[PDB]
Structures are given as C-alpha cells and as structure tokens.
C-alpha cells in the first residue's frame, strides 16, 4: 500500500514525537514506512511491520513507547536479543529493562515495585515468551497497569516464531494469544524480518490480529555483496583464510557448517594457520558456549565463529562484516535469512556461498518438497549471469525491484553484475526493425540470419541486413538473435522432412509488429565471450592526505568505544554504531554543533561519552576541510 494518510505531521503527538526523534535518538530523516508506522501506532492502530534486517524496525515501536502514557511490553524470543536492545536504550537514557528469568528475585521484585507505583519512568519492558506462560507473577502486575490505562501496547518482536512454517518456530509464541484475552483494549504490534509471504500471512492468522495496518518494504539487502564461488574441496578453509585476511583481517564474521563436526574441524584448520577461529554449536558445554559468544560479540580473542545454522541463529551482533556458507544451503529461503543477518549496522558486508554439485549428492543423502527447495538453491548457484539480488527476490515473488541496482550502487554489486560493470547497454531498435523486415519478406534458420547479419562469406543472401552487424562479435550477434526469440519479437517453428528430421527456422513473433509501430524499443548489452574476457588494470585510486587521516582517526574512535564499553558495562557497539563512528571520523571536527548533526549523536551520549571522543578528534583539527 501507500500510507499517505499516516504521513501527515498535523497530528497532536507530532510535536512531542519529533522532539524525541531528534534529541533522544539523534536521527534526522525517517526511512521507508517509519514515520507512517510510528504515527499509526501512536493513534492506537494495530500495526504489522515487514522490513528486512537492518531496515529500522526498532524505531517503529521504541520511539512510540517514549511518547506514551505507561509502559510498552515487548516480547522477544531470546534474552541475548533483549539484552542488546536494553543496552542500546539505556545508552540513550531511555528507561527500560526486562524479566527474562535469570534476574534474581530481589532484582525481579524491584522491577515489580517500579511498575506498581503507577508513576513509572520506564517506557520499554522487554519480556520472554515462556515467562508470560510460566510466571503468573508478571500478569498480576500488568493487570494493574491496564486498570490505570498504562499498558501502552504489546510489541511482538520476531513475530515469525509463531509459525511452524518459519525458519525458527517456537511453541511459546502460540500461547501469546492468551495475552490478548485478558487485555483486549491494548494495541498489538508485530514485527518480522521474514521475506517469505507464506509465513508473513500465517503470522497474522495465528496471532489472530484482525485486519491490521500492514507496513511492508522491499526485502532487498542494500548493503550486502552476494558472492558465489567455486568450491574446490579440501581447500575451503584455505580460501576462507585467504579471503578474510585480504578483505577483513580485523572484522568479525561467521562461517556456517553442516555438522557439529565440520565446525570443530573448520575451526581447528583455521586455528593452526593462525586465525582466531572458534566452533559454535549445541555440542559445547554451557561454560564453553557462553565463553565463545563473550569473545566473539565483544571482539575479544575471536574473529570468526564456525557455527551450525541452527546454533548460529541463536546469537548476533550488528557489525558482522562477512558470512560464509561453507557448503550448500538447504534452501534459498534459508540462505537469504542466514546471510541476511549480516551487516545489520548498515555497512557493506559480504555473503559468500561455496558451491559444487558434489555437495548436492552430499545434501541428497512433504520431504518431496524438501528436495525441490534444494534444487532451487542449485539453480541460484549455477546461474552466473542474472543479478543475484533479483534471483533471491524472485523466489519470494517480490514485485517492483529495478534491475539497475548493482550498476547504480557499485560498492554493493553482486559478482554476476561485477562481470558486466564496464559493458554499455545501447538502443538497437533500428537494427531490430531491419531484422524483422528481412524475415517478413522471406525459410531461414537462426544461424543463417546471424551469418548474413555478420557479413560472412558463408552468407546465402547479401541483399538486406547483410553486414549490418559487421561491428558485432559472433558472440554478440548470436546473443541478439537469442534475445529476440526470448522477447517474443521473433519465434521458432519446427520443420520436418524425409525421415523425421526436425529443423528449426525463424519466423516473426507476436511482439514483432508492435516494434514496427514504434511502440516497443529494445536495449541490448554487448558482452565479451567467456573465453575472451580481457583482464582489468588492478591499480586502484590513490589515497589523499585527508583520507589517510579519517582511517587513523576512526581507528582511535573505535578503541574509545571499546574502552567505554567495558567501563559502562555495555557492548562496544551499543556506545556508537559503525555508521556513527565512520561519520564522526569523516568530519574530523571537535565542534559539537557539527557532531550533533550526525545520526546517532545525542546530547546525553555526547555528554557521557563526549570527552574521550572529542579528545581524539582534536588531534586532527588542522585537517578539517
């Protein structure tokens, strides 16, 4: 839809809402369907948010919570996710906390104390699903908020967990409907990063949200570079080692393995070559598992985790710079969600799939449908021409996406689109007209036409289009006529002779005439043959004196966040996110009037984290032009 209705700033809350948006969160401009969804939520509407990873779903309910009487209750599937959000909120001086269960009864009761006072300073109250089900202690508190009209809304994060059709089904999410029974008056809000429409639909039916406002979005991952690479067996680990050290020596990443064993093996092989790799799966003791996620999330002695897909979903950080699938994913849907969680922080990240058909026989060893999905994954890997962004979205039936993306956004081009980045698409409607006219006048096979069009001495006819494509490759000439058959401008019918010998010849297609009228134009891209590709001059843009200083500055800025983290007892990225930091460095300014103009820089954060950051930026004061 298009929510023109929810786009207005005439609303009563708009004054207060923009105040928190600018001064508390530190943001400047709303992204797609953010203002619309926020407005709607603050009008008491039932909202259903569909946005890809890193879209900006948190703002869609966190901002409304800050500008509402009472507390918003957010259901999350994992305390890890909960902990990260609460850490983000308290870092912005937004009162919030959680009852996951590992909070001792003394602390737990103290929470119930603050909620009972009916003067709560707390806007967000995160909660786990089994807690509501198991603890009848929490319920009797919420009921009191309900009576005083202080239950703002029920936010259901990761809403795809209610569906058995989802990549992560959870039993307790089915029991969330009992929360609405006791509290019907309360606005409900569901968010998910699932692109699967079949799952998206089921969420609403299962959670039984009756005709909500649906805020959808393009599930294209704007900041992910999709790579498929040839998997020469027995040197996967070496290729991961080679790639990582070349592109991301000092950044975190994930390598997905099929088995608990391949995790252990992959981690070992990488380790003995000097890479800080660790294995991550359910086979680990609870002490080990906790130790892995401690080291990886905080970037303390671990760069890469070698995890099973099942277990890798259980933890996350926003600045994952690369995700590698060591084998062949079970499905395209699976692969998209797995590689999608990379680069949540919005910075460029890499998605590398190592492919061999050998893995198919491997993977081969409604289960009939399970085989179908596998082959669709194989089709994705084998397809080395069509833009990989389109291949993924086509699997979900997403409509609207412009195939111009990788060309307009070189920094995040897929490998397929990297091949053709230098080729120019031109209009050849003239030549097509000539061709259609030639065929219309005259029994020719496609190849016969190609020869004539090229100017071969093997050409039967020299009258019409002969030599018209004298500046075409035989490779391109053949591609053009191939294109014309596909685009229905030309057609092909079988001709049989003496003994069942079938020979195809070119005729006009239904879309031929519409070209002569001038209503249809065709665009053709001339490409090199595979055995004819010329190498490219590797030498890249030279660094400038200022560009050298932002790197060094950003480096120091990063450490300041790392230190501030341990001090304030918080993950280093819940201080300043990657984009905020990168932009601070790009300003090189110590002038607070310029810093506050950057996304993520707020008065509170620049007050309690400011001195250290401004200090570093002062050193480069004589470069701030």
């Amino acid at each position: 839809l298009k929510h023109e209705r929810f786009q207005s700033l005439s609303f009563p809350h708009t004054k207060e809402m923009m105040k928190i948006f600018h001064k508390k969160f530190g943001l400047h401009n709303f992204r797609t369907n953010q203002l619309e969804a926020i407005n709607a939520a603050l009008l008491g509407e039932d909202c259903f948010i569909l946005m890809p990873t890193g879209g900006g779903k948190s703002l869609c309910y966190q901002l409304p919570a800050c500008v509402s009487p009472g507390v918003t209750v957010v259901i999350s599937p994992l305390r890890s996710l909960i902990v990260d959000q609460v850490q983000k909120l308290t870092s912005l001086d937004i009162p919030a906390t959680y009852l996951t269960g590992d909070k001792t009864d003394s602390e737990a009761t103290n929470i119930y104390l603050q909620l009972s006072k009916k003067d709560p300073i707390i806007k967000l109250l995160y909660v786990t699903p089994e807690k509501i089900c198991a603890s009848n202690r929490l319920i009797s508190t919420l009921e009191n908020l309900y009576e005083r009209k202080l239950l703002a809304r029920f936010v259901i994060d990761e809403a795809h967990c209610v569906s058995q059709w989802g990549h992560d089904f959870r039993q307790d999410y089915k029991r969330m409907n009992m929360l609405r029974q006791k509290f019907p008056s309360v606005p409900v809000m569901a968010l998910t990063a699932t692109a699967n429409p079949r799952v998206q639909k089921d969420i609403l039916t299962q959670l039984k949200i009756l005709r909500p406002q649906v805020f959808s979005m393009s599930f294209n991952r704007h900041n992910l570079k999709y790579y498929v690479l040839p998997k020469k067996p027995k040197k996967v680990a070496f290729d991961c080692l080679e790639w990582i050290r070349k592109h991301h020596p000092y950044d975190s990443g994930i390598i997905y393995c099929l088995s608990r064993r391949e995790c252990d093996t992959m981690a070992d092989t990488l380790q003995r070559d000097g890479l800080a790799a660790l294995a991550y799966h359910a086979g680990l003791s609870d002490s080990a598992r906790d130790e892995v996620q401690q080291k990886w999330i905080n970037q303390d002695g671990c760069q890469v985790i070698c995890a099973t897909i099942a277990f890798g979903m259980g933890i996350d950080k926003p600045d994952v710079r690369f995700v590698i699938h060591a084998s062949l994913p079970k499905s395209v849907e699976g692969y998209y969600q797995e590689s999608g969680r990379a680069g949540r922080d919005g910075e460029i990240s890499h998605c590398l799939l190592f492919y061999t058909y050998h893995d198919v026989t491997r993977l081969k060893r409604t289960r009939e449908t399970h085989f179908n999905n596998l082959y669709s994954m194989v089709h994705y890997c084998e397809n080395i021409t069509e833009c990989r962004r389109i291949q993924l979205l086509a699997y979900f039936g997403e409509n609207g996406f412009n195939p111009d993306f990788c060309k307009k956004h070189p920094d995040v081009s897929c490998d397929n689109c990297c091949k053709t980045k230098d080729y120019k698409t031109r209009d050849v409607t003239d030549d097509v007209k000539s061709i259609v006219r030639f065929v219309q006048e005259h029994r020719f096979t496609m190849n016969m036409l190609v020869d004539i069009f090229l100017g071969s001495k093997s050409a039967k006819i020299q009258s019409g289009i002969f030599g018209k494509g004298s500046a075409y490759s035989r490779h391109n000439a053949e591609r053009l006529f191939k294109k014309l058959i596909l685009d229905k401008i030309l057609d092909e019918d079988l001709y049989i002779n003496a003994n069942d010998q079938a020979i195809a010849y070119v005729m006009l297609g239904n879309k031929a005439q519409t070209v002569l009228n001038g209503n249809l134009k065709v665009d053709f891209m001339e490409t090199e043959n595979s055995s004819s590709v010329k190498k490219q001059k590797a030498l890249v843009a030279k660094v400038s004196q200022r560009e050298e200083m932002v790197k060094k500055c950003l480096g120091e800025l990063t450490e300041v966040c790392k230190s501030l983290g341990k001090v304030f007892g918080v993950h280093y990225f819940n201080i300043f996110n990657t984009v905020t930091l990168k932009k601070l460095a790009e300003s090189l300014s110590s002038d607070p009037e310029v810093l506050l103009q950057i996304d993520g820089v707020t008065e509170d954060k620049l007050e309690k984290y400011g001195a250290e950051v401004i200090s570093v930026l002062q050193k480069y004061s004589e470069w701030t032009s």
């Epitope: 190849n447 191939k482 058959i485 010998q501 079938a502 020979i503 195809a504």
Partner: nanobody, 119 residues
C-alpha cells in the same frame, strides 16, 4: 566431428525422478536443435522433447508437464528432467544433435541409456 556422451538414468521406483544428461564435444560444430528420443521394448524411436539453440522448447503429449528439456551453452550440455516416473516410461533414451547449415544438417546420436521404472 561431433560426439554425444549420455549420463544419468538407471533403475528407480515409480513416482521417483530422474535427470538425463548429454554433453556435446567436437573440435568445431554448429547447433540447430537438440532432442531426446525414447524407444520402448517393442517399438521404434520416438522424439519426446526437442530444444533449439535459442531456447525454444517443444514436447510430445505423453511427457508434457512432467518432463523439462533444457540446455546450457557454456557447457554445451542438454538435460531432460524426468518427473513422476511410471513403468510405461521404461525405455532406452537416446540423445540427438542436429547441426545447422554450415554442416549438412548432420544428425548425431548417443549410444542410449536405460531408464527402468519398476513398480
């Protein structure tokens, strides 16, 4: 001048699926169309699916919907994805390549492979 190597096929229970392959080899050659034939125990060869170099496909009734013929030019390979197999499909399956006009529209054949569908 042209060599056709067939792979895939064999014994399989009904309802199962098979994938036949046909790789084309030669120092140089042209392609007008490529077709799959099949020969039941007491019958002659029957063209069940055919594809042209441009991608235009064409099928017989008995296989329509179930069988999908396709070609990869970069690897000069031609497939026939056989779905929903039945004991009637039990036959020898030959690959076929028809060259274009630079050659005599020559027709090359593979040796044939057995697709046996047991109940």
């Amino acid at each position: 001048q042209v060599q056709l190597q067939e792979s895939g096929g064999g014994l399989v229970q009904a309802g199962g699926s098979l994938r036949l392959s046909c790789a084309a080899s030669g120092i140089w050659f042209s392609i007008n169309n490529m077709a799959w034939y099949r020969q039941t125990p007491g019958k002659q060869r029957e063209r069940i699916a055919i594809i042209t170099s441009a991608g235009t496909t064409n099928y017989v009734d008995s296989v329509k919907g179930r069988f999908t013929i396709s070609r990869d030019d970069a690897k000069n390979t031609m497939y026939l994805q056989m779905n929903s197999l039945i004991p009637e499909d039990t036959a020898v399956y030959y690959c076929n390549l028809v060259a274009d006009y630079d050659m005599g529209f020559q027709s090359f054949w593979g040796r044939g492979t057995q697709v046996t569908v047991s109940s």
